[PDB]
Amino acid sequence: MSAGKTVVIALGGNAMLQAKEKGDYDTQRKNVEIAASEIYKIHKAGYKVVLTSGNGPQVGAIKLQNQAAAGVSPEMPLHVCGAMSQGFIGYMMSQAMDNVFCANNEPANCVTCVTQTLVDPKDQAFTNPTKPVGRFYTEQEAKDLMAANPGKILREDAGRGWRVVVPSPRPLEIVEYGVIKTLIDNNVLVICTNGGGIPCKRENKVISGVDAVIDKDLATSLLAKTLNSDYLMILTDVLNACINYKKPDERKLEEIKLSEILALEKDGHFAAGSMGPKVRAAIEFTQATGKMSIITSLSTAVDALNGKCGTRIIKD
């Protein structure tokens, strides 16, 4: 609706996969219906919505299929695989999103937009692959897989297993920003930058895909500020940022000033952890716009917009 503030919301892996679930279509779709239903409440509450997501498991699978079927069908580059994954994931989200609309007697206007993200060709990440993608292997399967493929390489995800990593450079620009803004201006629920957008580079007037996978969160933060949006939510499965998890003095984070959190991020309280970039993302945005950023669970998304829970970082 013409009156609403804009919120840029970044769905996580759990919007598609639950802890160690299998990625058949029907599984992922059901979890996407679950998230749509929570997202709809925010739109019903009158906010304008931009929806992003990650694609770790999904892009990983596409790449796996491209390699497995290589002798029988030409194998696509990683960046092409991402494009396909946005097609997959975007379709699920918009279809689920349309279905809840219709269940609530609202006519559907929501689209997924294919999204390219510009990055730096000389990013350190292009000489040192950080980002986990696909499903988990085991050391034997993993430490082997550099047997036929020395160029491929896996890494510790602590207990759950061994995962392919790849360049994860800094998002510099959302190529489609202008069109996304135009859509929200018109009260369209936009789905975009799924998996952080197709990593690309631009030199001498030409854009072309690079093999990589960008950070969802940093990308979303990037978008939210270029959009100068009102809120940024990252939605995890942790209803909450915690200092000192597993501790007598575990302090759960709520509505925090920019001061403490930005300091805690050099008590390095989030360094090693799934929540590192999630914090930086939030800080980066609040820091840049003075607007509130939120980190909370899918379950409590509206609740956190109404100030009832979630970590919400606040301007100083």
Active site residues: 13-14, 131, 216, 278
* Residue the block writes with tokens 């993200």: 117
Of 212, 194, 195, 202, nearest to 173 (Cα)? 202
Stretch that binds a copy of itself, among 92-100, 144-152, 228-236, 290-298 (CB under 8 A): 92-100
Shortest spacing between CB 252 and a copy of itself, in angstroms: 37
Do residues 239 and 298 touch, judged by C-beta distance below 8 A? no
For residue 4, the cross-strand partners are: none
Cα atoms found within 13 Å of the Cα of residue 84, Cβ hemisphere only? 17
Of the residues 90, 132, 196, 199, which one makes contact with a copy of itself according to CB under 8 A: 90
Q: What is the C-alpha separation between 303 and 282, in angstroms, rounded?
A: 18
Query: How many of the other CB atoms lie within 10 Å of CB of 1?
Result: 8
| Closer residue to a copy of itself (CB): 207 or 271 | 207
* 65 lies in the site for a copy of itself, by CB under 8 A: yes
Query: How many of the other CB atoms lie within 10 Å of CB of 241?
Result: 28
The site for a copy of itself, by CB under 8 A, has a size of 56
| Binding flags for a copy of itself, 4-23, as an x/- string (CB under 8 A) | ------------------xx
- What type of residue sits at position 268? G
Q: What is the C-alpha separation between 12 and 21, in angstroms, rounded?
A: 14
The three-point CA angle 235-113-222 to 5° equals 50
Of the residues 17, 83, 174, 239, which one makes contact with a copy of itself according to CB under 8 A: 83
| Closer residue to a copy of itself (CB): 54 or 310 | 54
| Binding flags for a copy of itself, 157-176, as an x/- string (CB under 8 A) | ------------------xx
Return the residues of window 201-260 that contact a copy of itself according to CB under 8 A: 205-209
Pairing status of strand 293-297 against strand 311-314: antiparallel
* 114 lies in the site for a copy of itself, by CB under 8 A: yes
What are the residues binding a copy of itself (CB under 8 A)? 22-25, 61-62, 64-66, 68-69, 72-74, 76-77, 80, 83-88, 90-92, 94-95, 98-99, 102-103, 107-114, 116, 175-176, 178-179, 182-183, 186, 188, 198, 200, 205-209
